[PDB]
Subunit: 427 residues, 4 copies
Amino acid sequence: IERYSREEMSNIWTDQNRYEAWLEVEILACEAWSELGHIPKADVQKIRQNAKVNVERAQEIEQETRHDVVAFTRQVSETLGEERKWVHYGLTSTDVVDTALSFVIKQANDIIEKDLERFIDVLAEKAKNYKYTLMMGRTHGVHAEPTTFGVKMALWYTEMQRNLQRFKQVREEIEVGKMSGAVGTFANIPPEIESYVCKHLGIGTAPVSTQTLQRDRHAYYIATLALIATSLEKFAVEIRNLQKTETREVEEAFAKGQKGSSAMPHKRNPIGSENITGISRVIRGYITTAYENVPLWHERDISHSSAERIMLPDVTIALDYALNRFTNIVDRLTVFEDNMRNNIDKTFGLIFSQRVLLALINKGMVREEAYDKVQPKAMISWETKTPFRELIEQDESITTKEELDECFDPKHHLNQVDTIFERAGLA
Amino acid sequence: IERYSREEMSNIWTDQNRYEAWLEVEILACEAWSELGHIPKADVQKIRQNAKVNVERAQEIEQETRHDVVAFTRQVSETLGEERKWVHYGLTSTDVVDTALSFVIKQANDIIEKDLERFIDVLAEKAKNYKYTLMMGRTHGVHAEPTTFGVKMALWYTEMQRNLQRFKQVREEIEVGKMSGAVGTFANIPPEIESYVCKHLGIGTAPVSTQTLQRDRHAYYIATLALIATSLEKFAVEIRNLQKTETREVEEAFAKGQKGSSAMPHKRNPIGSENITGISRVIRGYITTAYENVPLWHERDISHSSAERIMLPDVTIALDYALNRFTNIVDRLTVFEDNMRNNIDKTFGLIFSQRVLLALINKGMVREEAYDKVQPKAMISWETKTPFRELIEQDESITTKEELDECFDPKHHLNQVDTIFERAGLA
Amino acid sequence: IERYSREEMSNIWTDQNRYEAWLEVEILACEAWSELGHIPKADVQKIRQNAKVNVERAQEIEQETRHDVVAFTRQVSETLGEERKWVHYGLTSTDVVDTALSFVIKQANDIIEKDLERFIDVLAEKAKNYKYTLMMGRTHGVHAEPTTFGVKMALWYTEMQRNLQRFKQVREEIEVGKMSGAVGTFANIPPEIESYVCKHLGIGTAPVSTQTLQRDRHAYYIATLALIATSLEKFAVEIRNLQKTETREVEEAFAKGQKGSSAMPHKRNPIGSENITGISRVIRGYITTAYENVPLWHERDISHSSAERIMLPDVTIALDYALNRFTNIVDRLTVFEDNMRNNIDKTFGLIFSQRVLLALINKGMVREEAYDKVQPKAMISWETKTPFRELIEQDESITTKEELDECFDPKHHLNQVDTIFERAGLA
Amino acid sequence: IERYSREEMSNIWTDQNRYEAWLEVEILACEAWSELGHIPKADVQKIRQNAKVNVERAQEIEQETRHDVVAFTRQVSETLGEERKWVHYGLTSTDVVDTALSFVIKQANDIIEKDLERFIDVLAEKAKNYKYTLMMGRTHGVHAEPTTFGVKMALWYTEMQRNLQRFKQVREEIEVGKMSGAVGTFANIPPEIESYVCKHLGIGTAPVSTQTLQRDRHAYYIATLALIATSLEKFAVEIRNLQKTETREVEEAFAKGQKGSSAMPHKRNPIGSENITGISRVIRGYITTAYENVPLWHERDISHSSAERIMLPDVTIALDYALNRFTNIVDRLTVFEDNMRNNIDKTFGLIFSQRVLLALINKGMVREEAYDKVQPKAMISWETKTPFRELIEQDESITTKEELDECFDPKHHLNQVDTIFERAGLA
Ligand SMILES: Nc1ncnc2c1ncn2[C@@H]1O[C@H](COP(=O)(O)O)[C@@H](O)[C@H]1O
Ligand SMILES: Nc1ncnc2c1ncn2[C@@H]1O[C@H](COP(=O)(O)O)[C@@H](O)[C@H]1O
Ligand SMILES: Nc1ncnc2c1ncn2[C@@H]1O[C@H](COP(=O)(O)O)[C@@H](O)[C@H]1O
Ligand SMILES: Nc1ncnc2c1ncn2[C@@H]1O[C@H](COP(=O)(O)O)[C@@H](O)[C@H]1O
Ligand SMILES: O=C([O-])C(=O)[O-]
Ligand SMILES: O=C([O-])C(=O)[O-]
Ligand SMILES: O=C([O-])C(=O)[O-]
Ligand SMILES: O=C([O-])C(=O)[O-]
Ligand SMILES: [Cl-]
Ligand SMILES: [Cl-]
Ligand SMILES: [Cl-]
Ligand SMILES: [Cl-]
């Protein structure tokens, strides 16, 4: 997953940054105790200045201590003088590990939120730039009635707007800390320590907690980040569908898939969209794992920790990369407006049959009289390969021909587009 | 799943009720068109009065029509006179199927919401009724420090309060209708029809839609209802853990598992909690299915419909039954307050070691001097089977014995309970 | 799931049939004990003759007994005289429930195995009937080189042949019984009882067991039945792809989707394939549930039982219906051999570029000289809309034109078909 | 996942080793063509000697080529002279990528197979070393009847023996190659090339293939490797259950969890087992992803490739580490034989009630007379806290007391152990 990681998200999930987050939690812990008259401020001002993380040293110590917080606590302590004594004062491993983890998630969520807002903009501009670009609506892969590429982009815009709303919400659920002690009873640690750290780390407090944060928070979070990935797959599948050789209504404007410098000009592949699809299949795996991490035993068990070492970075790193790669795909996406408008007539004008029927009935004609002077001619249009108009024009529906144009006009279906865009927040 | 269905939820997912929901949508559709001057109101007032659903008749017609909305449309039409003509006027199958489905979900969500609020009350009363009931906090299945059964119930209370909040939110996402036509372009159906129906059905409108509602709504909904099921499993696993023979700290007060009328008095099983666990394993299955229903093709494809015929009833029926069965389990749950307080001393008072250490250091003693007059005696307490006090009392820690009571007092750990309950909204 | 159930599989999962399976297990249990001189044979010959199941009576008794085996045991006992006493002699609930469940699975597996062999035949005949039917191979949805519809059906044939092989194997894993007593120690029940029943029920014995069969058996079984469902989805997605309006290379020969008796002749939908896709999304859900049923506690816990009440019938009923509906779809599937052969030339003969290149180099020409008298003309073929031949024919590649036919001949790609069919076991 | 990776498996999934596997495939490809008289052997003997992989160079070239096989092909080519020309002769990207991937899996499967056989040995020795170690069988977490720790280890031994059998099978499904060309038609590449490479790489041939291997192979493989992970979780959950403070029947002999050098001797945690549980939650995620990779489009689509870049290494690396860490846990696992035998009497001898009942009836006594001189005394044993014997001895069941020893003897339940071990293949 170094091939599928952008730099900013990748750095967040390094050991450097996890230990630095433990340090901040620890130091802030001492600042909290100090306001409560347990530790002299001078000693804490010393700690902030002299404390340095060393990933290699901590990991040397970890092979003997067999415990990762103890190792960290010892490492930092080797960079300090006497103020060593206050490092981790009246705290338990997971008061740090878990408050710090929520902090790092807050950092990851800052990125993903920006990715989401960017993608929403890309979708807003694509929508407006193809507002009236007629193409075929398709149901079961079959031509039904026309629509516009702009409307399809508006469909996506509002989906993402739903997905952002969600994500914003789950952030308040997940960016939450805990410093409630060995069993969540605040027995040997007042709640004002938690209150202090979490305010300064810019996160909230779990009102009631165990040794660890409650994992229904994490699970919904994964659920959410997976929903975003799934709808990215939806969009990617659209592009894949529309880039098919027989359609050619859009094209990933990357030139990828070959043929640019070769003699195979037809090889225009949606491999980026295929990529996004496959990453989506991974993000969704961790729905299982995140959900199975909820039934921890009693106050705590640590099984969730090994699983979320792999899942939390993977899922945020994958999601960050998918959001941006597909934001680019969509931005650069090449839309063939003429191929779209051409494909409207692959069904020989049979999509405008109900309109010719209606046009006859709304002209003094009987509900069945009009039906028998359309249906048989409509049939022959499909069986032979000739326009639906040319067969209608032969029979006496003439005396009208001045406005069969209106029945066969796909621009009829644009009549509510301005409202669809208003509804979507794109006016 | 007739063994795991309560009556009110079961009736919602019958064919009677689905067709009745199609009828209401249809009739309301005609009321909408009528205000728009397409249909005479008299004909619609006729329709409401004369239209009757017949599940057997519709299904007879369906074996030849091979289409379920057409079948319905024909059935109702046989119960009407001339006003037949306006049934389904200017509508497409899925404008009804899907607006009606969202309506039936609204009905299911009314039940589940009530189940959630009831369970929250059961948890509020259990919390207050055991606010100060000392038991052992357990980490990795091992004794750590004391806590109270009331606090554990408060932990659950706030989880559910999170889960309700979620559920309330997703309801606004899911209880949403659509009457936007064959491809979501409003081309041949003004949006004021959708607006009319959905207001009268008490649901909202999808701003931009395809032939069908967008399935990220459904998926998050399932996600959510599965999270609630997973945390029910969490709680059920707690009960299972605590009802183990070696613990006996709680007991499903059902008398189930045998021994009441037999000569096997020790067989007190948590089979209800085991049941809830197993249903939870089913609800979570449909996370997959709901998520894989999102990548529909273009304007629509119908694959989601076969999957949500089974999933939507199953998941709501299962969840309704799990919420209520476990609400009862918890309400009736028998708590052995004495067994809890006894088990605190299965570790021979070794849980109060840090407090004796502290008590010595906070009395003029050196940080290490106090450590060497606890640790070796603490060790011998575990290896032999004798109280930690009796070995401390032999050595000159005397000159104090008047308040070793305070070090060995588990009621120390109650000092923040009143605040934990205040935080949880149970003051 | 009454809409998605065939009759034979549906009957297997009724209460009638589960109780009848408990009866047989019980009776056979008594026949076993009898050979071991615990029960007189006359009493057992009585039992077989007089014992009748009554689903309504058992369920009446179950509302007070609160236990389903006890209820059954009491019901049957009301249909017997004195020989009542031997019903369930020296047995525990789950020795019956679970040996009987494996038996009912054996019955379900008889159906599915037949469904699989039928589908394999349908695929063998489709393969042979289109052995040489040229169509376009497609990669990333884009034209690559030709293939034949027969070869594509052979691809499916061998997949299913893999899937049958698997299924055959997992049957030996799952069609396995247990009568080892309360904790699997054979303490109060010799193994020759288990041996007797299981031989007569036509199933094997779990060498070492707990109170219950070990659920890794069930999980692999579900895994398997889900793999079969997933590859059915694969095939269904192919059909869906190929039935798209722009392709029209195949068509579900059902006439479903409308237009037969209407004036919308273009509405030829693959709704059956869409259906199979959606059922597939359900079968895969129960991968989760089956796998989470493996970590039972100690000798047993009953959580697996509530989950497999719903899963085992659902998954077998769904899979039986999907196998047969799609076997029919494929059998009746209408293949448009001319549309296939036409679509080969939608890329204007650009798929035969490497062959013209090769044909020049394999004629005294330089590896690059031939490349510059193809590539630029190939490019112009795609940009304009004119055959690749017509632009090649203008330049002096003439002096040859007698066998540009061989370069542009798609029948080149049939040269190994007879071997592909031999490899697949279709010669 | 560098914290959860052993070295041998980790090296297999490096870029060095993937490119080296591409090289071997390529070179072998040239050896195949050479036997077929397309390439001079001297040129291929040159290629084998001069071709060197360079991971950094290939990745430099990949940022411009935007294609990873082309990049590789160019890199190796820079290490060769004129024999460059034959590198990748008449092959397509995925003939190499995918034949090579199957090869690397073969390598991974060599490791996992060894891990499985080692774990099976560890389980065989544990079984024999505790063959007769009496402990309580537990159902619903409650005492039922005795069993032995040896029998429980035999239960695990046979499970793993099932899991190995499976794994052996799926290896033949997965360790399979493909060199069938752009669309699997062998059109421009005889099957004897595939035959040649795959024989020399020690893998089999896919009889019918597309551009890529068919992903039902991979999915079953993941399914399988996840089943093994799930049963590891089962075992780990057992250990976790049994190491609980109230039980203390086993203990991870690592000394991990603290208290060795501290004054908290009761902190004996099963954190290794907790770890294995959490990794298991990850391996199972990729059931989803592997299964969703099966519906590729037509001849191929590349979405499976991004997902199996992450999944295939992760799942094999995780599984290798879980198998070995838990093999060690089990080997070193400390069994408290005395605590086991003590816990048998936590139910006050009530587990031997049916045996006292039987002992009275099998002595001239009536089926009900014996029931009323046990049940009421059994009840009082549980309500008070006094042995079941002491209350039986007060009533005239005397005139017998010489062999109440036989009724209350747990060594009764060992009577079939020698057969359970024979059944399991441990005699
Ligand atoms: N009660 C506990 N709270 C926090 N960390 C712990 C606890 N017990 C052990 N650990 C350590 O935390 C790490 C967990 O490992 P892992 O399962 O790989 O995340 C190991 O270094 C453990 O020794
Ligand atoms: N475009 C469509 N919109 C709504 N329903 C349809 C459409 N096409 C077919 N149907 C019918 O809806 C039902 C879908 O079946 P199922 O897949 O079992 O939910 C069948 O009766 C189909 O004939
Ligand atoms: N140890 C046991 N073995 C078999 N069945 C049991 C056991 N304990 C309870 N049962 C009953 O089996 C059924 C399990 O219910 P369910 O969870 O719905 O499958 C109920 O009727 C239980 O009372
Ligand atoms: N038809 C194809 N066969 C094999 N590889 C391809 C094909 N098309 C593109 N690729 C390349 O294979 C890699 C796939 O990327 P990923 O999705 O990250 O595995 C990229 O370098 C693609 O450019
Ligand atoms: O050692 C500790 O404090 C822990 O594990 O929480
Ligand atoms: O027939 C219809 O209207 C449909 O299928 O939507
Ligand atoms: O009552 C029984 O025998 C049981 O539950 O197994
Ligand atoms: O370029 C190629 O050969 C490919 O992508 O398969
Ligand atoms: Cl929390
Ligand atoms: Cl929507
Ligand atoms: Cl078994
Ligand atoms: Cl294959």
